[PDB]
Symmetry: C6
Subunit: 334 residues, 6 copies
Amino acid sequence: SEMTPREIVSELDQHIIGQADAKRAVAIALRNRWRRMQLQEPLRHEVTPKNILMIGPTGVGKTEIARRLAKLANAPFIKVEATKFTVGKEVDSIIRDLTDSAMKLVRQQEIAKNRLIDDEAAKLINPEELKQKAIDAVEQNGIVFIDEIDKICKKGEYSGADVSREGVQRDLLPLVEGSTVSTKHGMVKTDHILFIASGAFQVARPSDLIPELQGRLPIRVELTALSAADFERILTEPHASLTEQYKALMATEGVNIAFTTDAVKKIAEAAFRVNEKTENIGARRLHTVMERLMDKISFSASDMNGQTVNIDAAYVADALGEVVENEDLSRFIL
Amino acid sequence: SEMTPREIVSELDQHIIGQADAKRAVAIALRNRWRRMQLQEPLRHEVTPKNILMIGPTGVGKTEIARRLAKLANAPFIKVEATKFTVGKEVDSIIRDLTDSAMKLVRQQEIAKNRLIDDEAAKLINPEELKQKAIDAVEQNGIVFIDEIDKICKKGEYSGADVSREGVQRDLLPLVEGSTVSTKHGMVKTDHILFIASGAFQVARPSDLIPELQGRLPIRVELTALSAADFERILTEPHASLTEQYKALMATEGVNIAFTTDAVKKIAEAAFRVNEKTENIGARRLHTVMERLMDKISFSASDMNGQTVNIDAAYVADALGEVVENEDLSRFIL
Amino acid sequence: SEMTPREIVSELDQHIIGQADAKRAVAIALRNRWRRMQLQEPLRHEVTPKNILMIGPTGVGKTEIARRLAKLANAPFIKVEATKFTVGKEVDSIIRDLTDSAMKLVRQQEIAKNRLIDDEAAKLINPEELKQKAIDAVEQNGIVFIDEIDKICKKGEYSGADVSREGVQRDLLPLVEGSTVSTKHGMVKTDHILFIASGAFQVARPSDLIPELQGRLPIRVELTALSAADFERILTEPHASLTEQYKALMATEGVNIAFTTDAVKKIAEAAFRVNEKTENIGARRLHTVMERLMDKISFSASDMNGQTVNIDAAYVADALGEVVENEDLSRFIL
Amino acid sequence: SEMTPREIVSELDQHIIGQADAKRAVAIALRNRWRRMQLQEPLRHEVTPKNILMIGPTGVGKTEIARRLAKLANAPFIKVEATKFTVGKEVDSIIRDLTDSAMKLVRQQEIAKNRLIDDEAAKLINPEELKQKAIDAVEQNGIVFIDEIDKICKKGEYSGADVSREGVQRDLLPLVEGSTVSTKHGMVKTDHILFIASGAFQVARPSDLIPELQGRLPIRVELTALSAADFERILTEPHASLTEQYKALMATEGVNIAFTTDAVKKIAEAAFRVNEKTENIGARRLHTVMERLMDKISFSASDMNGQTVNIDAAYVADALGEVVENEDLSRFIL
Amino acid sequence: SEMTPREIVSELDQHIIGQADAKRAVAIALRNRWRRMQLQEPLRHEVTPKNILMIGPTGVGKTEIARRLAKLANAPFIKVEATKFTVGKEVDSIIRDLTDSAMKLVRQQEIAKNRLIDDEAAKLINPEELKQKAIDAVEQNGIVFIDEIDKICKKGEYSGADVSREGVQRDLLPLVEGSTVSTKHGMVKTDHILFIASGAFQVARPSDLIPELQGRLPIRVELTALSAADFERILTEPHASLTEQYKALMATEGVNIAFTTDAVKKIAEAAFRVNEKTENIGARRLHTVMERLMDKISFSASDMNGQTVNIDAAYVADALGEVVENEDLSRFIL
Amino acid sequence: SEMTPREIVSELDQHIIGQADAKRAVAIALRNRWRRMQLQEPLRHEVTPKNILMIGPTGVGKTEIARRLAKLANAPFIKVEATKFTVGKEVDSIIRDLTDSAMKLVRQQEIAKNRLIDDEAAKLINPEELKQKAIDAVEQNGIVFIDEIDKICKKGEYSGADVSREGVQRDLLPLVEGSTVSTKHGMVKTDHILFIASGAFQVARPSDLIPELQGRLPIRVELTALSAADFERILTEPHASLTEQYKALMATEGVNIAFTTDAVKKIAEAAFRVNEKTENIGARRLHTVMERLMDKISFSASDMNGQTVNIDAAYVADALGEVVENEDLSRFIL
Ligand SMILES: Nc1ncnc2c1ncn2[C@@H]1O[C@H](COP(=O)(O)OP(=O)(O)O)[C@@H](O)[C@H]1O
């Protein structure tokens, strides 16, 4: 898009708390596409996407940053899990699924951008028109998110699976290097598709990836663990935060809810407490804690039409009970 | 549907004895769909289904609650066994089978809702009409029941199958996270499909599921073991209970049967006795015990037209004989 | 059909010697279909087939009872071996093959039930007419015989194959529980298909089957070993018995044969003697013994037109020679 | 055919030396088809083919007897190796290949039996005409030869392959028991297809085959080893014997050859000598010995037009040299 | 093409630094095609391509020389990883993918070489016209690059994979020897396709390849390791070098950058330093170092419109910081 | 063809040096086809091809003799590697690929044998015309070369692969025995296809092949190792020898080269020296040595237009340097 790096980050800031480095890395990556378009031949086709490799713990915004990025750029997105390819599925599926994603994007945008009348829905839908467009979207703005790419790295005492793993990287090369893949909508060039690979790299390191693949993931960026304070912001700041979602849902029932300031600190404190006591699943822990919290009101909201319900610290401690501190309970409920 | 949580539970109560927590959890889940529909963009598409994970022993109503739920909501249902995916079958089959289920639902409802005349059965059946409808049903009201999801959790001394198991969870992610799957009726978005996963979690715990999947199963609910008293109610209270079924079947033969109060306690006592002496298969034990009980009358009902047969405690003890107390017999017969 | 349990058993008696319990179990099962049809909604669709599990030694009439049952009911039958499913074949094949079987049944019955003229064979054969009929036959009267279902039960020191075995039961569930399967003739509901599972259960017990599958095989019935006296009756009583078959075959050659009373006792005595001395293969042993007996006359019948040949005890002892008592010979010849 | 057992054996005698028992067994089997056709319903469809199991060493005429049998009966034949089925191929292929074989038989017989003119080759070739005919041939006269069926028998220390082997027998059951298989020419009933199974049964015995399969191979017959005297007859008596073939081939070159009486004894003596000194491959040994013998004359026959060449004992000893007695040479050359 | 060896090398020199031997080997190979075309039958079809085997370390120009070669010759190129073939993929895919590559080359060249007007894009696009052309391109000028062919060589303690590896070479033979492969565009002869195989041959040697394959890789050539001085030239001399690319990208932002002489020595010194301290990935190391260097300016270039930025030694040392010397950092960042 | 054995060998002599026995064996084999055609029914179809098994070291002319044979007979050829079949590929592929080969042969011969005019290329190309012809070529003159057939023989300590190997022979039987295979051009009878199997038989012997397959490879012939003197002749005598090829290639550049008598002895001496010092790859060694020799002149020929270059002993010793005697070098370069 015509958006500048800072404008892209400003947009990302409204959905993702923190992770400024990753926000900048993807902003740059998206801006480069615009820059390349301002170039002239023969340097235009020589310049390829600077794929990004995100390094960070689980549930801190890696995928979300990528999803959001694709959203604000109005581009075809696709998430895939690396280990998925170690019969089975062929990597080309990635580009295939991605072209489908591009179809919806093109369809809903075409038919909508041109308005009993159902029998006259065509008059714009040219079988070749849409196919070339979907292809065009994928070839020029396609974004592929490759999760757990650190799990296809040679682990310890190599050989056995470390032969199958590297085979996955190997099979990914044609895609990140620039290949032509066949899809039900025609051929697709992967040359300018932006690739975002992710991994925790707890044991494995990026230098463990086969060399041909390291060179195709030039941009290395780290995402940080989230703090209780971060959970606090996430709960209320991002567009469509959990508190805003629940507030809107109860409203359809005639119930007006409100979270006091400390009730939010309490919720975030609960999530962070379970992650550090058991397994840290990051921001995701916020989902179960909120559901546990909104359990009761969610079920009986229909019987409280016209009421305002204040969810304060007391309400939160009541709803959570002994769950947070008792692993026997938390490992089931949260 | 327009049904409120309490109305949904009231309906569930007429088919399932007990399990109030699970009945509430699914009621909420179904009501949320209605609520989301009352929202406005851009918060409407941001709100996703709060998938449910049922935790409980075998044969206590987990699936039945899900089946019934789909029934009362007039929605496409599909049951699948997790371990089924560890060539083989691809998870997308789930969404494929589910779209077929949606086809029948749409067909039988369309042709019926619009009435020699066989050659004029069309005049409503538009190849595109039904396909978009079936797709619409699945995308907006689809319900998937994933049984034994605790068997695809990393067991002990991980690795070997614990690599294949988690691969299943991994492959399930795109579905529970929101993917587009191709089906003979067109593309299908799984974004708003309600997922109900089930497991006994005797050894494994929900916290053992990969994190990306925990976050997509926010609602955790427990189902309880059933008591002899519960078996008692099940035998006669639910719509189409076993006693009501047998009574109606014998009636077609001209035989009027009746179960005395204690005969029912005796039947339920027998089932509960075998489950606690051998393997507890819950309510299912009621099927074999009833068949053993109705064996004789079922075969000769044709020769008793016009008779009323009272099945009392004595009749039950006679029909069961030594089966209940002799494992050598019970493990074959019941 | 409109046939009563006793009428069904009377018919079965003319093909199968003994096994009264199994004859009654299948009679009941077939009668239930008629009964369910006399019911009214919504109890009509709630009542499902009471599948049968036959427990008994090999070659005593399990399959034959099922084959015959399908015959007298004019219904689509299909036999399948359980272990067959442990790439490979998918259980849906069962329903697919079963629908084909239903096609022949419908075709031969339609074209025949409506009578140079070859070019006018149509005028009734409507591509949609037959397909809906075949589907209808399978959905309403389909019968599936699942042999060796005890071989897919967890054996000893479980795990290894006991994981693959139970997977088979698991994959069978959708069929016995009620699923929709796609076939070249359209979709097929397995909801009202009657399932008859068989097994010797020498080591494994029915209680070893996964619980979901036990509940779907409510009727447990035992078949007994056959005696020399039973072999005696089988040789001459059932319609199309072996003696009647051979008598009719030789007659086409102009040869009239007759078995004296003791010649039959001798034949049955021979079969029973080999089964108890080596491996008991039940009634099947009667096939080889009869062939050994009719060997000579069968070859030269063409040269004996106009003759009556009396097969007496002496003839039988001559034809059999030392085979019965010498395992070295019997294990090759019989 | 209308041929009697003795007429069938007389025909077989002109192609196969010895093996009177096997010749009689297949004659009977083929005659039974005719007999069954003389029967009336409902005994007609009840009578099934008496499949044959041939027991004997390699290269003594088992397959040849079956090939010839199919020839003289003008029926679709197909040879298959059992172990072939232990992805891979599905047994149904057998019936598929067999239907193709039936196509050629029907085509060449139809177009031929009805006579620039190439553009008028049709006027008889009705796409449905031939397909129903080919189907008819296979269903009524099809013959399947199953070689090495003793290799799919449970060997020693069962389990491992003895599980896969018996699976083959299991998968063969539907075919020998009577199934319907789909083929590019339509559905095919295997009910009346005659099956001839073969095996050396050196270690395994027929009683080792699963019981369901023993019963479907009622006729057991043994083929004997061949003697030097048998090799002697084979070399010159059967239609298209090796000597007759070579005599006709050299004649096209203008060379008249003749084998003296003792030259033939010498050739047969050589073959029998190598089989008993190394590995006995039966009659097949006659192929290599004849080729070694005719090597020289075969190459230079073109330069001997007009000559009569007498192949006598001296010629044979010359051509064979030291090959027969030197295993180092015989294992390469013969 | 009509280009002479020296003209081809002169062209290669503008993209690849060093590697004169490999540049000559491919120049010769490409010139031979022209020479063969000047020959007359029957010597014309007897002369086959002198395939090349490149021996050298990773990231020194093996693939690039091949890519460039295909470019300057306007020929269909395809890169493939040998181990990729050890279900899976069939080598024929190589020729299939290669024919697709040839399609784009032909299309873009045809429609372009012949010029509202969109509905009149045809008038040249003959379905058969393009297919025969694409086929023609592949058959006459096709170039296949087979990477890591030394990994399919029998390693140590042969057998296990050394059986699968050599199978790959075996399956490659038909292609390098001259085969006909089927593709969606028709049949394709691989007879005159130039094959370039590559490998590091650190342990394995060319003499380890199966003999049939050695003979089809007649030209053996070595590529050398690159020096810091080479990295220096690569950074600025080749067309579309990294410095030229970055200069052009920033220019679209209104930023004029310039690298001082020593800044370039510093960049090349950094890359060479990391390769010799950790893992030598050759020229590829230049990608990560440049990205690390241009990180800051790349993100904020939009805010520096109108500025000239001099990237000198100081700027480079600043941007790199401690990364180069700290393996803990370099293995993540570079 | 009408060619006599001696005429066929005379033709083979102009392409293959030595191997008189193998040349005679294939000449005979090809002549037999002609002879069989001179026969009358019913002996005509009884006579089958005398398949050949070639026994000899690698690179001595086995394949070449077969290729050439197919050439001079204008017949469809196909080379296949036995171990290729141990999912994977099915032997029928052999007959399929062979029918394609037959298509080209028929096409290029038909369209050529019958002559702006491009739009009038048809008027002879009848879709059925060519298909029946290609089929006819394969059925009557098809030649299949089966390399490494000694690698599918039971090795040592049989079982493991010796079960898979023999399975290959087993699957080959239907082809060599006479089967019907389906191909995109119609059905194909393999009855008269000539099969040439090859192997080094260093450890395994022909007597190790399963008996059914020995009998179908009646003609056993040995090929000898080649001497330095043989290499000498090969370099210059065969049509399209290496020296003749290089002479013609340089001529297109304006360069006239000539090899002195001793220069040729020197080249052949070099090849033979490397084969006996390292691994003997036979005549193939001549390819690398010639390329090493012609390296320099081949690259600069363009700059020597008008020159005569005499390649004498001195030139050869110069070009080869230390390669021949230094295994470290020879195993890379030659
Ligand atoms: N609470 C209950 N109320 C009514 N019926 C029940 C209940 N629990 C079990 N059943 C009966 O027992 C069977 C149990 O299967 P299901 O409900 O799927 O549970 P589970 O998944 O634990 O086996 C069903 O056929 C149902 O009719």
